[PDB]
């Protein structure tokens, strides 16, 4: 959990959205941390409702 | 830990930049309730005046 953290730290503060192709974790999905971040694929948490 | 005494938004942004560069605990004081998008858990910002 290193590359997603720096990626969200840099672009998130600039209000520059970032699309996460290889991110299946909802940790950076609080709508507060990484306010400018997009998920190309859902995390496993959604699969929990499955 | 570090202590910050910001008096402007730019000061808070610069402090957040330096803190993320350091990734360490830093204390900052805001004259009121300051909603800051900087979500680094290592930064502790205290509103000087409580909400009325």
UniProtKB/Swiss-Prot annotation, chain A:
Task: Note the superkingdom of the native organism.
Answer: Eukaryota
Maturation and modification: NMDA is probably regulated by C-terminal phosphorylation of an isoform of NR1 by PKC. Its phosphorylated state is influenced by the formation of the NMDAR-PPP2CB complex and the NMDAR channel activity.
Q: In which tissues is it expressed?
A: Detected throughout the brain, in brain cortex, cerebellum, thalamus and olfactory bulb.
State the compartments where it is located: Cell membrane; Postsynaptic cell membrane; Synaptic cell membrane; Postsynaptic density membrane
**Record's comment describing the protein's domains:** A hydrophobic region that gives rise to the prediction of a transmembrane span does not cross the membrane, but is part of a discontinuously helical region that dips into the membrane and is probably part of the pore and of the selectivity filter. The extracellular N-terminal domain (ATD) is a site of allosteric regulation to modulate overall receptor function.
Subunit and partners: Heterotetramer; the NMDAR subunits are modular and harbor tiered domains that function in concert to regulate opening and closing of the cation-selective ion channel pore. Forms heterotetrameric channels composed of two GluN1/zeta subunits (GRIN1), and two identical GluN2/epsilon subunits (GRIN2A, GRIN2B, GRIN2C or GRIN2D) or GluN3 subunits (GRIN3A or GRIN3B) (in vitro). Can also form heterotetrameric channels that contain at least two GluN1 subunits and at least two different GluN2 subunits (or a combination of one GluN2 and one GluN3 subunits) (in vitro).
* Family statement drawn from the similarity comment of this UniProt entry: Belongs to the glutamate-gated ion channel (TC 1.A.10.1) family. NR1/GRIN1 subfamily.
Q: What does this protein do?
A: Component of N-methyl-D-aspartate (NMDA) receptors (NMDARs) that function as heterotetrameric, ligand-gated cation channels with high calcium permeability and voltage-dependent block by Mg(2+). NMDARs participate in synaptic plasticity for learning and memory formation by contributing to the long-term potentiation (LTP). Channel activation requires binding of the neurotransmitter L-glutamate to the GluN2 subunit, glycine or D-serine binding to the GluN1 subunit, plus membrane depolarization to eliminate channel inhibition by Mg(2+).
What is the protein's given name? Glutamate receptor ionotropic, NMDA 1
- Species assigned in the record: Rattus norvegicus
Swiss-Prot record, chain B:
Instruction: Write out the annotated subcellular location.
Output: Cell membrane; Postsynaptic cell membrane; Postsynaptic density
* Organism, scientific name: Homo sapiens (Human)
Family statement drawn from the similarity comment of this UniProt entry: Belongs to the glutamate-gated ion channel (TC 1.A.10.1) family. NR3A/GRIN3A subfamily.
Q: How is it modified after translation?
A: N-glycosylated.
- What function is annotated for this protein? Component of a non-conventional N-methyl-D-aspartate (NMDA) receptors (NMDARs) that function as heterotetrameric, ligand-gated cation channels with low calcium permeability and low voltage-dependent block by Mg(2+). During the development of neural circuits, participates in the synaptic refinement period, restricting spine maturation and growth. Forms glutamatergic receptor complexes with GluN1 and GluN2 subunits which are activated by glycine binding to the GluN1 and GluN3 subunits and L-glutamate binding to GluN2 subunits.
Q: Subunit structure, briefly? A: Heterotetramer. Forms heterotetrameric channels composed of two GluN1/zeta subunits (GRIN1), and two identical GluN3 subunits (GRIN3A or GRIN3B) (in vitro). Can also form heterotetrameric channels that contain at least two GluN1 subunits and at least a combination of one GluN2 and one GluN3 subunits (in vitro). Does not form functional homomeric channels. Found in a complex with GRIN1, GRIN2A or GRIN2B and PPP2CB. Probably interacts with PPP2CB. No complex with PPP2CB is detected when NMDARs are stimulated by NMDA.
Reading the lineage from the top rank, the first entry is Eukaryota
- Covered part of the full sequence, start to end and full length, is 195 to 246 of 1115
Q: Can you name this protein?
A: Glutamate receptor ionotropic, NMDA 3A
């Amino acid at each position: 959990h290193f590359t997603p953290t720096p990626v969200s730290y840099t672009a998130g503060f600039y209000r520059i959205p970032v699309l996460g192709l290889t991110t299946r974790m909802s940790i950076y999905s609080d709508k507060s941390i990484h306010l400018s971040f997009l998920r190309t694929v859902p995390p496993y948490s959604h699969q929990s409702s499955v | 830990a570090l202590l910050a005494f910001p008096q402007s938004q730019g000061e808070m942004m610069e402090l957040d930049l330096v803190s993320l560069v350091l990734h360490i605990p830093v204390i900052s004081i805001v004259r009121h309730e300051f909603p800051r998008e900087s979500q680094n858990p290592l930064h502790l910002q205290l509103s000087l005046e409580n909400s009325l």
